[PDB]
A paper describes a structure:
NA is an enzyme that binds and cleaves sialosides from glycans on the host cell surface to facilitate the release of nascent viral particles from infected cells, and is also proposed to assist other stages in the virus replication cycle. Crystal structures of NA catalytic domains, either proteolytically released from virions or produced recombinantly, have consistently shown that four identical subunits interact non-covalently to form a globular “head” with four-fold symmetry. We use homology-directed protein design to uncover the structural principles underlying these distinct tetrameric conformations and stabilize multiple recombinant NAs in the “closed” state, yielding two near-atomic resolution structures of NA by cryo-EM.
We found that the tetramer-stabilizing mutations in N1-CA09-sNAp-155 increased the Tm by 9.5 and 19.1 °C in the presence of CaCl2 and EDTA, respectively, when compared to N1-CA09-WT. To better understand the roles of our stabilizing mutations, we determined a cryo-EM structure of N1-CA09-sNAp-155 at 3.2 Å resolution. The 3D reconstruction of N1-CA09-sNAp-155 confirmed its adoption of the closed tetramer in solution. Additionally, a backbone segment adjacent to the space A mutations was slightly rearranged such that W455 packed closely against the introduced mutations and W457 moved away from its native position at the interface. For example, P99 and T196 (T195 in N2 numbering) in space A form a central hydrophobic contact across the interface that closely matches the same interaction seen in the NA structures used for homology-directed design. Likewise, I177 (I176 in N2 numbering) provides additional hydrophobic packing in both N1-CA09-sNAp-155 and the NAs of other subtypes relative to N1 CA09, while I205 adds further hydrophobic packing that was favored by Rosetta.
Author numbering:
A (entry chain C), B (entry chain B), C (entry chain A), D (entry chain D): 83 to 142, 151 to 319, 334 to 338, 345 to 428, 438 to 457
C-alpha cells in the first residue's frame, strides 16, 4: 500500500536514542566496510542504513567504482550482509510504500548522469544540464501520495548554481522545475513531508552562515527563504523541523569549531530573527566532535500513529566516528554525552 | 494473534537440555562478540537469545555505547548475524504475540532514562524517580492478554530502594504502581505468567539469603513475601516456579561458593520453612562453577499444548563460560555433568 | 500438508550427482566447522545437511557439549549460517510435511537419554533400558501418514544388544516394540518408506559380513533377515534399496580395504545367495577411499512425481574428506571418478 | 506464474550501468571465492549472479569437484552467502516464472553428462553424442510460454562439431533437433527471447572473425547465418540484439587486441555488409582490457513494462578483473571509462 503522507508532523518535546551505526570496535578484526556519511531511510516494515563504498575493508571521492549499499538499521556494514543498490558517487533513496526508489549519480564530473532505479530496475535517467558535478541530497527523499520528490544541484560549490526539483513516480520523472533563487545556494538538502507538502532545509556553502530552505507542493510550486532565527543570507549538511512559525534547529554548540550538538526549540524562529528560545536539549557533549547531520521520518504506516514522527542522524567526527540516530518523543528525556 | 497467558503452568517432573549459547571454542578464530548474562525469550514462532555488548570481539559496565542485540537460540553471537534491538546498559524483552517489546535503560547513573520500543519504534519513555541507577530485570518480561508487565528498581544496591511495577501496552505505559515493601530488596526479578497472574522471584542484595517474591494481577494489585523454604528475610539472579504451595527452586549445591546447580521440588516450600523435599535433579556438577540463572516460558501458541511450559537458563562461570538452557518435561530425565 | 508416503519407490536405472558437502579447500582460511559423517534429509521445500560438532573450527566422541546443527544442502557448514537443532552425541532427523522432528541422544554412556524435539520444542524423552550407550541411526528417519518411525539400539557393539522400534507423532512416542532378533546386530540403520511400509538396512558389527534388515508396518509388526545376495549372518554404515526381489547394493570395490564405491543391481539378490547381477555403475574410483554411506529419499510433495525418489550419500575418507550425494534417475549416466 | 515472452524486445537508444560483481578490493582480507566468467540471469523477483568455483578462496579447468553457485546481483561471492546450484564444469541457468532451471555438465571429457535440475531436483540427463567435451552456453537460457530452450555443442573446438537445440519443460527434455550447419561453429551461444522466438548469437572459434547466429521457434525450426555487418564466415563470447534489420553489436575498439568495449547501432547490419552505422556509445575505455561478454533479459513480469528489456555483462580482464553489467534505456546516457 502506497504511503499517504497527508498527516501533520508529530509535536515532539524531546529526542531519544534509536540506534548506533558505523561501529569501529567491531571492525578491529571483523570484515567491515570503510564508510562515511551513512543515511537512514524507512520503509513500512523496517528502517535501513545506506552508505557509499569502494569495497575497501578496514584493517586491509568521485569514482565509477564507488557503489551504494545498505544494511538494516543498527547492523554492521559488512560484505557478508550488505545489499547492493546502485553504482554512484552521490546518491539518495526512499520508499514509496510499494518499493524502493534509488537515485544515484555516476559518470564524469563534466557529464554526470543520474540513474533512477525502482525495485532494482533502471527506469529513467537525467543528464547534467550545466555540466559541473551533478549532485543530490545524500539523504532520504520525501514521498507524498505514492510520488517521491527530490532536489538536485548542478554548478559551482562557491557560486551561483542551477537547482532543479524532480517529482518521480515509480522511477520515472513526470515533472521537473528549475528554481529561480538568485544569491541562494542549495547543497545536500534534507527533505521531509508534512501535510501533503515537502519542506527542505539545505547547506549554503557560498555565503550563508544560516540555512536556506525551499518549500513546495506536489505540482512543484515553491517558496524560498532562510531560517530567520536574518531572513536573507548571512558548511556541513544539517536539518530543521517546521511547526507553524516555530522551528527545531539541529546545530553545534560552538560557532567557530565542530564541538557538541544540541536541538533548540525557537517558537518564532522560522520568521523571526531574535535569539530567544523556549527549550534546549544536549544530544552530543562539547568534548566530542559533531559533524554531518540530516533528517528522516517514520510514517503512520510504520508507527501505527496518526501523525509523522520526525527523526535525525548525527555523524560524530571523533575520522569516520559513529552515526548515532535519534527519534522524537513527547515524553521525558535527558541530555546525552557520548 | 496476541498471547493469552490464561492457562496454568505445566506440571514438570524433570528438566531436559534445550540449547547451548555463548560457545567460545568457535570464538578462537571466529568473529564472535564478548557477551555476559545472555537471556532467553520466546515468540510464537521462535526462541531468541539477547545480550549486551560494546562491539568488542574476542581475539581482538554502564556505557552509552553499549547496545542490546539478539540471535536465534543456539546460534553464534557474531557481528554478521546479530540483530540490533536498542541502546542500553540494562535491558529486558518479551513478545506479546504480535511484535517484540524491548525495554532498555541508557543515560547517566544520576539521570537514567528507559526507552521503550515496540516493533523497532520508540513508543514511550520513563525517567529515573529516585535518581540512583535505574535498572531492570535482565530477563524476559511477562505477557498476559496482549499486555506485558515488568518490575523496575531505582535506588541503592545495599539499602532501601524504590520499586515500581509497570503494565505496558503496545510500547506505552498505561498503568504503574509503587510498591510498599519495607526491608525488602528486589533486583533482577525473574517473572512469568501463570493463569492470568504475574509471579516474580527477585535477588535480595541487601540482607536476604533467601529470595523475595512479588505476585500481582493485571490491575497491579500485589502481595509480597519470601520463599519460606523464614517467610521473612534471612547474591546472584535466580528463579523458582510456584505450583500451589510447592516450589521448584533453582540453586547451587554449595552455600559459601558458586559450585553446582540443582533443581529441588519442595511441595510445601512456598509457605513452609522446613528443609524437606520430595525430589531433586542435578543440572550442573559440583566441580563446574554455576552463576547467573533466570526463567522464561513457552506459551501454548508456540508449543501446541494446553498449558505453559516452564524453562530456565544457567550461565556457567568456568570468566564468561557458556549459557545452557533447559526446559521442563513430565518424562524421564537424568542428572547432567557439563 | 503432512507427507503421505503411500507411493512406491521410483525404478532407477542409474545414479547421478546431486551435491558436494564438507568442502575443505574453502576451509583453508574460511571459518568452517570440523565435522564427520554428515547426513541428508529433505523437507517439502528444501534438502538440508545435518552434522555434529563441538564448535571446533578448522585452522584453529560422546560429549555433553557436542551439538547437532544444519545447513542447506551444498552450503558451507560455517558458524555464521549453521542452524542449531539439538544437544546430542548421536542423532537423527526427518520432516513429516509439517515440521522437523529431531531425535538426539545426550547424557552419560551408562544413563543416556534421548530428547525428542518437534519444531524446536522438547516434546518427549526415552531413557536407556539396558544402560550401555544408547545410540540411533545417524541418518534420516522415515515418515508415512504424518507419523515418523526410527530404530534405536542399547547394548554392546560386539554382542547381543536390545533393539527397539519407535513410532513418533508430533514429537511424542505413541507406540514402541522390542525386537526378538537373536544373533542379529542392528547399528546405524538406514531407513526409507516404500508403499506405506518402512524398510531398514543396518550395520552388523558383530558377526555379519553381509547386512541385516528389518521391515515393518505402521503398527510395528516386523520381519527380519539378511540380504541373501547367505540369508543368515556371515563394519561401516551402508544401505540398499528393495524392488520386489531385486536389490540395489551400495558397496566398496575391494573386500579387505575401503577402496572404491559401486552400485550393483541384483534382480534376485534380496532372496537369492547367487553372485549374479545385471548391471553395475562406478560411483567412486578404486584409488579414492570410500567410507560411511546411507540413504535418504525425496517425496512426491517435493519432486512433483507420482513415486518416491531414492537418493544416497557417500563420505570419501581421503581424514574427513567430502560427503558427495547422488540421486536416482531412469536416464543415461556414466561412472564417476572423484 | 509462468513467463510469457510473447512481447517484443524494447527499443533502446542507450545503455546505463546496473551493477558491479567480482569486486577484488573487498577480497584483500575478506573470505571471497576466486571466480571467472560470472553470468547473470533474472527471475520475476530478483536478478542473480552465477559462477563456477572449486572453493578456492582468494588470499589462501574441467573438474568433478567444480561447482555452480550463485549470489544476488551485486553481492560479494563469499562462502557465507553463496547458494549451491549444481556440480558442473560447464553450465547455464534460467527461470521459467515458476522455478529455476539449472543445466550443468560434469563427468569425463570423453563421456560427459549434462544433469538437468528443476527447483533443486534432478529431473533428466543428456549424455555426450560425439564423445568430445560436451559444453553449454555459460549464460542465461531463454524461456517462452513456460518452456526454456538452449543450444549445446559436442565436438572439436577447431573444426566441424555437432550442435543440438534442446526444448526443456520443468526440467525434462521434450524435444531436441540436430542442426545441419556445415562450416559453422557455435560455441558459448548467447540467447534471448523476442516475440515468441529464440535468437542466439554464438562464438566461431574455427574460421569466423564475425559472429554466427541461429534463430528458432518453439517447435525448433531454425535458420542460420552470420551477422552481415560477409553474410557467410570470414575468439571470445559475445552478443548482439536484433531489431528488424538493425543490430546492436557489442565489440572491442581494437581488432588485434582486447582493448575497450563499445555498442554500435547498425540499422541495416543484420543483412548488409556495409560498415556504416548511426550511433555509437563507449562502455569501456581503450586503456582498460575488455574480455568475455553476454546478454540477459528482464521480462515484463519483473519490470512492469509491456516489452522485454535487453541487458548485458562485460568482464574486464584487468586476470579476473570485475564483471560490470548494464541495461538498455531510451533516455540520455554518456560514455563510461572504468
Ligand atoms: C489521509 O488519506 C486517507 C485516505 O487514503 C484518510 O483516511 C486519512 O484520514 C487522511 N489523513 C489526513 C490527515 O488527512
Ligand atoms: C492523490 O493521488 C490520487 C490519484 O492516485 C488523486 O486522485 C488524489 O486527488 C491525490 N490526493 C492528493 C491529496 O493529492
Ligand atoms: C483462554 O482464552 C481463550 C479465548 O481467547 C479460551 O478459548 C481458552 O479456553 C482460555 N483458556 C483458559 C485456561 O481459560
Ligand atoms: C482481556 O482483554 C480483553 C480486551 O481486549 C477484555 O475484554 C477481557 O475481559 C480481558 N480478559 C482478562 C482475563 O483479563
Ligand atoms: C496416497 O493418498 C492420497 C490421498 O491422501 C491419494 O490421492 C493417492 O492416490 C494415494 N497414492 C497411492 C499410491 O496410493
Ligand atoms: C492414515 O491416517 C489416517 C488418520 O489421520 C487414517 O484415517 C488412515 O486410515 C491412515 N491410512 C493409512 C494408509 O494408514
Ligand atoms: C501475451 O499473452 C498474454 C496472455 O497470457 C496477453 O494478455 C498479452 O497481451 C500477450 N502479449 C503480446 C505482446 O502478445
Ligand atoms: C502456449 O502454451 C499453451 C499451453 O500451455 C498453448 O495452449 C498456447 O497455444 C501456447 N502459445 C504459444 C504462443 O505458443
Amino acid at each position: 500500500v502506497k504511503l499517504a503522507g497527508n498527516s501533520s508532523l508529530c509535536p515532539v518535546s524531546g529526542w531519544a536514542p534509536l540506534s548506533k551505526d558505523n561501529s569501529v570496535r567491531i571492525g578491529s578484526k571483523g570484515d567491515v566496510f570503510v564508510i562515511r556519511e551513512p543515511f537512514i531511510s524507512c520503509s513500512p516494515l523496517e528502517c535501513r542504513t545506506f552508505f557509499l563504498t569502494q569495497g575497501a575493508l578496514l584493517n586491509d571521492d568521485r569514482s565509477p567504482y564507488r557503489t551504494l549499499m545498505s544494511v538494516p538499521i543498527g547492523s554492521v556494514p559488512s560484505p557478508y550482509n550488505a545489499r547492493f543498490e546502485s553504482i554512484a558517487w552521490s546518491a539518495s533513496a526512499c520508499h514509496d510504500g510499494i518499493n524502493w526508489l534509488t537515485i544515484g549519480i555516476t559518470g564524469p564530473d563534466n557529464g554526470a548522469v543520474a540513474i533512477l532505479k525502482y525495485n532494482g530496475i533502471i527506469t529513467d535517467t537525467i543528464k547534467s544540464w550545466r555540466n559541473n558535478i551533478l549532485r543530490t541530497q545524500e539523504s532520504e527523499c520525501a514521498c507524498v501520495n505514492g510520488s517521491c520528490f527530490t532536489v538536485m544541484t548542478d554548478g559551482p560549490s562557491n557560486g551561483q548554481a542551477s537547482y532543479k526539483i524532480f517529482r518521480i513516480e515509480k522511477g520515472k520523472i513526470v515533472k521537473s522545475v528549475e528554481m529561480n533563487a538568485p544569491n541562494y545556494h542549495y547543497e545536500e538538502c534534507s527533505c521531509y513531508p508534512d501535510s501533503s507538502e515537502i519542506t527542505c532545509v539545505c547547506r549554503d556553502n557560498w555565503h550563508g552562515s544560516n540555512r536556506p530552505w525551499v518549500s513546495f507542493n506536489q505540482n512543484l510550486e515553491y517558496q524560498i527563504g532562510y531560517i530567520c532565527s536574518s531572513c536573507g543570507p548571512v558548511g556541513v549538511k544539517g536539518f530543521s523541523f517546521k511547526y507553524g512559525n516555530g522551528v527545531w534547529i539541529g546545530r553545534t554548540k560552538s560557532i567557530s569549531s565542530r564541538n557538541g550538538f544540541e536541538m533548540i526549540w525557537d517558537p518564532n524562529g522560522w520568521t523571526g530573527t531574535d535569539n530567544n528560545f523556549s527549550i534546549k536539549q544536549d544530544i552530543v557533549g562539547i568534548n566530542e566532535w559533531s559533524g554531518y547531520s540530516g533528517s528522516f521520518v517514520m510514517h503512520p504506516e510504520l508507527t501505527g500513529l496518526d501523525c509523522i514522527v520526525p527523526c535525525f542522524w548525527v555523524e560524530l567526527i571523533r575520522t569516520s566516528g559513529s552515526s548515532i540516530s535519534f527519534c522524537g518523543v513527547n515524553s521525558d528525556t535527558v541530555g546525552w554525552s557520548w
